[PDB]
Scaffold this active site. Structure first.
Site, PDB file in Angstrom:
ATOM      1  N   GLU A  35       0.785  -0.860   0.138  1.00 47.21           N
ATOM      2  CA  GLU A  35      -0.054   0.259  -0.104  1.00 47.21           C
ATOM      3  C   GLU A  35       0.662   0.732   0.525  1.00 47.21           C
ATOM      4  OE1 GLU A  35      -2.090  -0.214   3.451  1.00 47.21           O
ATOM      5  OE2 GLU A  35      -3.985  -1.275   2.075  1.00 47.21           O
ATOM      6  N   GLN A  53      -2.570  14.914 -10.085  1.00 42.28           N
ATOM      7  CA  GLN A  53      -1.645  14.474 -11.310  1.00 42.28           C
ATOM      8  C   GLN A  53      -1.277  13.338 -10.743  1.00 42.28           C
ATOM      9  OE1 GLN A  53      -0.689  17.755 -14.135  1.00 42.28           O
ATOM     10  NE2 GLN A  53       0.659  16.077 -14.791  1.00 42.28           N
ATOM     11  N   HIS A  69      12.778  22.255  -9.057  1.00 45.08           N
ATOM     12  CA  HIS A  69      11.345  22.510  -9.623  1.00 45.08           C
ATOM     13  C   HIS A  69      10.289  23.249  -8.628  1.00 45.08           C
ATOM     14  CE1 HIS A  69      12.948  20.509 -13.393  1.00 45.08           C
ATOM     15  NE2 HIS A  69      13.117  21.091 -13.074  1.00 45.08           N
ATOM     16  N   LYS A  79       3.728  17.672  -3.687  1.00 45.37           N
ATOM     17  CA  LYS A  79       4.438  16.169  -4.313  1.00 45.37           C
ATOM     18  C   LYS A  79       4.526  14.894  -3.576  1.00 45.37           C
ATOM     19  CE  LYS A  79       6.232  19.293  -7.389  1.00 45.37           C
ATOM     20  NZ  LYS A  79       7.672  19.944  -8.027  1.00 45.37           N
ATOM     21  N   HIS A 126      11.774  20.864  -5.683  1.00 45.17           N
ATOM     22  CA  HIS A 126      12.350  19.219  -5.557  1.00 45.17           C
ATOM     23  C   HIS A 126      13.389  19.353  -6.295  1.00 45.17           C
ATOM     24  CE1 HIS A 126      10.970  14.943  -6.897  1.00 45.17           C
ATOM     25  NE2 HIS A 126      11.895  15.065  -5.993  1.00 45.17           N
ATOM     26  N   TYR A 139       5.649  10.298  -8.774  1.00 43.43           N
ATOM     27  CA  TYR A 139       5.116  11.556  -8.147  1.00 43.43           C
ATOM     28  C   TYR A 139       3.698  11.730  -7.987  1.00 43.43           C
ATOM     29  CZ  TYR A 139       6.936  14.981 -10.881  1.00 43.43           C
ATOM     30  OH  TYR A 139       6.387  15.750 -11.661  1.00 43.43           O
ATOM     31  N   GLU A 150       6.444  26.942 -13.920  1.00 42.28           N
ATOM     32  CA  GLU A 150       7.119  26.742 -13.949  1.00 42.28           C
ATOM     33  C   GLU A 150       8.106  27.307 -13.609  1.00 42.28           C
ATOM     34  OE1 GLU A 150       6.632  23.391 -16.490  1.00 42.28           O
ATOM     35  OE2 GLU A 150       6.997  22.455 -15.017  1.00 42.28           O
ATOM     36  N   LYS A 175      16.750  23.645 -19.488  1.00 45.17           N
ATOM     37  CA  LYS A 175      15.721  24.432 -18.808  1.00 45.17           C
ATOM     38  C   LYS A 175      16.683  24.266 -18.036  1.00 45.17           C
ATOM     39  CE  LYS A 175      11.817  22.467 -18.976  1.00 45.17           C
ATOM     40  NZ  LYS A 175      10.629  22.752 -18.354  1.00 45.17           N
ATOM     41  N   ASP A 176      16.972  23.106 -16.932  1.00 43.09           N
ATOM     42  CA  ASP A 176      17.451  23.269 -15.878  1.00 43.09           C
ATOM     43  C   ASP A 176      19.729  23.588 -15.517  1.00 43.09           C
ATOM     44  OD1 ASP A 176      15.119  22.141 -14.351  1.00 43.09           O
ATOM     45  OD2 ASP A 176      16.220  19.681 -14.519  1.00 43.09           O
TER      46      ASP A 176
HETATM   47  C1  LIG Z   1      -5.396  -5.965  -1.343  1.00 46.13           C
HETATM   48  C2  LIG Z   1      -4.611  -5.676  -0.276  1.00 46.13           C
HETATM   49  C3  LIG Z   1      -3.564  -6.573   0.459  1.00 46.13           C
HETATM   50  N1  LIG Z   1      -2.497  -5.693   1.764  1.00 46.13           N
HETATM   51  C4  LIG Z   1      -2.209  -6.862   2.331  1.00 46.13           C
HETATM   52  C5  LIG Z   1      -2.673  -8.327   2.669  1.00 46.13           C
HETATM   53  C6  LIG Z   1      -1.359  -9.332   2.595  1.00 46.13           C
HETATM   54  O1  LIG Z   1      -0.354  -9.654   3.526  1.00 46.13           O
HETATM   55  C7  LIG Z   1      -1.366  -9.429   0.986  1.00 46.13           C
HETATM   56  C8  LIG Z   1      -1.002 -10.063  -0.214  1.00 46.13           C
HETATM   57  O2  LIG Z   1      -3.104  -9.745  -0.316  1.00 46.13           O
HETATM   58  P1  LIG Z   1      -3.625 -11.048  -1.734  1.00 46.13           P
HETATM   59  O3  LIG Z   1      -5.100 -10.466  -0.837  1.00 46.13           O
HETATM   60  O4  LIG Z   1      -2.922 -11.802  -1.551  1.00 46.13           O
HETATM   61  O5  LIG Z   1      -3.392  -9.700  -2.389  1.00 46.13           O
HETATM   62  P2  LIG Z   1      -3.201 -10.267  -4.439  1.00 46.13           P
HETATM   63  O6  LIG Z   1      -4.836  -9.093  -4.465  1.00 46.13           O
HETATM   64  O7  LIG Z   1      -2.524 -10.096  -5.300  1.00 46.13           O
HETATM   65  O8  LIG Z   1      -3.474 -11.145  -5.012  1.00 46.13           O
HETATM   66  O9  LIG Z   1      -0.960  -8.079   0.906  1.00 46.13           O
HETATM   67  C9  LIG Z   1      -3.058  -4.428   1.714  1.00 46.13           C
HETATM   68  O10 LIG Z   1      -2.553  -4.635   2.738  1.00 46.13           O
HETATM   69  N2  LIG Z   1      -3.008  -4.148   1.458  1.00 46.13           N
HETATM   70  C10 LIG Z   1      -4.147  -3.890   0.138  1.00 46.13           C
HETATM   71  O11 LIG Z   1      -5.421  -3.299  -0.614  1.00 46.13           O
HETATM   72  C1  LIG Z   2       6.469  18.220 -15.205  1.00 46.79           C
HETATM   73  C2  LIG Z   2       5.453  18.139 -16.632  1.00 46.79           C
HETATM   74  C3  LIG Z   2       6.387  18.170 -17.968  1.00 46.79           C
HETATM   75  N1  LIG Z   2       5.732  17.978 -19.340  1.00 46.79           N
HETATM   76  C4  LIG Z   2       6.417  17.360 -20.089  1.00 46.79           C
HETATM   77  C5  LIG Z   2       6.656  18.959 -21.011  1.00 46.79           C
HETATM   78  C6  LIG Z   2       7.624  18.133 -22.048  1.00 46.79           C
HETATM   79  O1  LIG Z   2       7.733  17.299 -23.011  1.00 46.79           O
HETATM   80  C7  LIG Z   2       8.491  16.833 -20.814  1.00 46.79           C
HETATM   81  C8  LIG Z   2       9.501  17.490 -19.701  1.00 46.79           C
HETATM   82  O2  LIG Z   2       9.442  18.199 -19.032  1.00 46.79           O
HETATM   83  P1  LIG Z   2      10.222  19.203 -17.768  1.00 46.79           P
HETATM   84  O3  LIG Z   2       9.856  19.798 -17.746  1.00 46.79           O
HETATM   85  O4  LIG Z   2      11.850  18.663 -18.691  1.00 46.79           O
HETATM   86  O5  LIG Z   2       9.825  17.616 -16.991  1.00 46.79           O
HETATM   87  P2  LIG Z   2      11.108  17.853 -15.324  1.00 46.79           P
HETATM   88  O6  LIG Z   2      10.601  18.163 -14.323  1.00 46.79           O
HETATM   89  O7  LIG Z   2      12.035  16.127 -15.306  1.00 46.79           O
HETATM   90  O8  LIG Z   2      12.583  18.692 -15.929  1.00 46.79           O
HETATM   91  O9  LIG Z   2       7.038  16.337 -19.881  1.00 46.79           O
HETATM   92  C9  LIG Z   2       3.982  17.320 -18.734  1.00 46.79           C
HETATM   93  O10 LIG Z   2       3.896  17.078 -19.781  1.00 46.79           O
HETATM   94  N2  LIG Z   2       3.697  17.686 -17.445  1.00 46.79           N
HETATM   95  C10 LIG Z   2       4.009  17.764 -16.191  1.00 46.79           C
HETATM   96  O11 LIG Z   2       3.652  17.700 -15.577  1.00 46.79           O
END
Ligand SMILES: Cc1cn([C@H]2C[C@H](O)[C@@H](COP(=O)(O)OP(=O)(O)O)O2)c(=O)[nH]c1=O
Ligand SMILES: Cc1cn([C@H]2C[C@H](O)[C@@H](COP(=O)(O)OP(=O)(O)O)O2)c(=O)[nH]c1=O
Ligand SMILES: Cc1cn([C@H]2C[C@H](O)[C@@H](COP(=O)(O)OP(=O)(O)O)O2)c(=O)[nH]c1=O
Ligand SMILES: Cc1cn([C@H]2C[C@H](O)[C@@H](COP(=O)(O)OP(=O)(O)O)O2)c(=O)[nH]c1=O
Lengths: 193, 187
Positions: A35, A53, A69, A79, A126, A139, A150, A175-176
Site C-alpha cells: 500500500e 495529477q 522545480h 508532491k 524538488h 509522484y 513553472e 531549462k535546468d
Molecule cells: C489488496 C491488499 C492487500 N494487502 C496485503 C494483505 C496481504 O498480506 C498481501 C497480499 O494480499 P492479497 O489479497 O494476496 O493480494 P493480491 O490482491 O495481489 O492477491 O497484501 C494490503 O495490505 N492491502 C491491500 O489493499
Molecule cells: C512536469 C511536466 C512535464 N511535462 C512534459 C513537458 C516536456 O515535454 C517533458 C519534460 O518536462 P520537464 O519540465 O523537462 O520535466 P522535468 O520536471 O523532469 O525536468 O514532460 C508534462 O507533460 N507534464 C508535467 O507535469
C-alpha cells in the site's frame, strides 16, 4: 531483513513540514504487495490536499539531475515522491518567503530497495539526482501541471548549497542547465505556519 | 496527453498516455483529474497499491470488494507485462458475467479503468512485473471476495493455464454460481 509492524511509518524531517513515509512490504511466494498511499492514514499525519495529477519519469543514466522545480501560486504542487526502480538522492528546498528555514533543504535516498516516499509540501522546490541506471520516479501532485507557472533554480546554487553526491558526469535538461540563481528567482509562496 | 477508448463493455476504459522522450529518458502524465472526469472516470482515489510478481504465470484474481466498499481501479504496469481482465459482476447488467481483457505493459504504458461493480484479474507474462493501481475505496479485507480464475461460466481465455502460481485465497476462489455479489447495475 528490515521489519516494520504498522502499514506506514511517518517521520518529520528537520524541516518538519517535509515527511518521510516508510510503507510496509508484504512478501510471499508470488513476490510482494505494498500500500503506497492511503488517504485516511496520510490525512491523520499532516498530508492534506487532493492529488489531481500523477507523473512518471524514466532517467536512463546515473548523473541525470532534474530540478530545482516549483510552480508559482496559485498552482503550487505538493508532491508525494517514490522510486519504483533505481535510486535517487531526493531534495526538498523550503522556498516559502518569511519561513524560518527559507533556502534550507533536506535530502533522503529514495530507491526500489527501501520503497521510501517523500512528502514535499507546496512552497518547496524538488530536485533529484539519479544514482542507478533506468531510474523510474513516480509522484502525485496536489495541483495540475501549469507550464507558464513553472520556475527553475540551478542545482549548484551557492546560497542553497545542496551537497549533491555528484559522481563524475551530470546530465541536465536545457531549462535546468539554464536554471537561475536563488538571488534572482521569482518566488510568491508565503510562509503561514 | 491522453486517448480514452471505451471497451465492448463501455464502462471499462483503456487509457493511452503521451510519452515525451528526451536525452534524459522520458516523462508521462499517468493521471490528470480534469481530463479523466471529462471522459467518464469519476470518484476520489483514496488508495494506491503496488504488486511485484517475480515469475511469468503468477495469476491474481478474480477480486472485488462488496458494497459499500466497491473499488474502482486505474491499473498500469510500470515494469513487465500482464494480461489484464475486467469482469462485469453488476446484478441486472446486460453484460453480467462477461469480461474484457487488454495487455498492460512497460512497452505500451497503457492503463485500464475498471469501475466499481467489476472484478479484476491479471496474468503475469514477463518476469519482475510491477503492477500499480489507484482505488476509489480503501482496502477492507472483510469485504474482499474471490472467484476462481478458470470459472467455466465466465470462461476467460487466459493465454496460460499450466505453470500457474496462485495465492491460497485465489486457489480457493469460489465458482461464479456460488459467489456473494451485492453490486447493482444502474447504467
Ligand atoms: C489488496 C491488499 C492487500 N494487502 C496485503 C494483505 C496481504 O498480506 C498481501 C497480499 O494480499 P492479497 O489479497 O494476496 O493480494 P493480491 O490482491 O495481489 O492477491 O497484501 C494490503 O495490505 N492491502 C491491500 O489493499
Ligand atoms: C512536469 C511536466 C512535464 N511535462 C512534459 C513537458 C516536456 O515535454 C517533458 C519534460 O518536462 P520537464 O519540465 O523537462 O520535466 P522535468 O520536471 O523532469 O525536468 O514532460 C508534462 O507533460 N507534464 C508535467 O507535469
Ligand atoms: C547538511 C545540510 C546543510 N544545509 C545548509 C545549511 C548551510 O547553509 C549549508 C551548510 O554547508 P556549509 O556552508 O559547508 O556549512 P556551514 O554553514 O555550517 O559552515 O547548507 C541544509 O540546509 N541542510 C542540510 O542537511
Ligand atoms: C472472446 C470473449 C468471450 N466472452 C464470453 C462469451 C462466452 O460466454 C465466453 C467465451 O465463449 P466463446 O467460445 O467465445 O463463445 P461460445 O461458447 O458461445 O461459442 O466468454 C467475453 O465475455 N469476452 C470476450 O472478449
Amino acid at each position: 531483513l528490515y521489519f516494520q509492524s504498522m502499514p506506514f511509518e511517518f517521520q518529520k524531517m528537520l524541516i518538519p513540514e517535509v515527511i518521510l513515509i516508510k510503507p510496509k512490504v508484504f512478501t510471499d511466494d508470488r513476490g510482494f504487495f505494498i500500500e503506497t498511499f492511503k488517504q485516511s492514514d496520510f490525512r491523520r499525519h499532516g498530508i492534506n490536499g487532493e492529488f489531481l495529477q500523477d507523473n512518471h519519469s524514466l532517467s536512463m543514466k546515473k548523473g541525470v539531475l532534474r530540478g530545482l522545480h516549483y510552480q508559482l501560486d496559485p498552482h503550487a504542487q505538493g508532491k508525494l515522491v517514490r522510486v519504483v526502480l533505481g535510486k535517487v538522492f531526493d531534495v526538498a528546498v523550503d522556498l516559502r518567503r518569511e519561513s524560518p528555514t527559507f533556502g534550507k533543504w533536506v535530502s533522503t535516498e529514495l530507491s526500489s530497495t527501501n520503497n521510501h516516499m517523500l512528502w514535499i509540501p507546496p512552497g518547496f522546490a524538488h530536485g533529484m539526482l539519479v544514482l542507478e541506471e533506468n531510474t523510474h520516479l513516480l509522484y502525485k501532485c496536489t495541483a495540475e501541471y501549469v507550464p507558464e507557472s513553472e520556475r527553475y533554480i540551478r542545482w549548484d546554487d551557492p546560497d542553497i548549497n545542496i551537497k549533491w553526491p555528484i559522481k563524475n558526469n551530470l546530465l541536465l535538461s536545457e531549462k535546468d542547465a539554464a536554471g537561475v540563481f536563488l538571488q534572482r528567482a521569482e518566488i510568491n509562496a508565503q510562509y503561514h505556519g
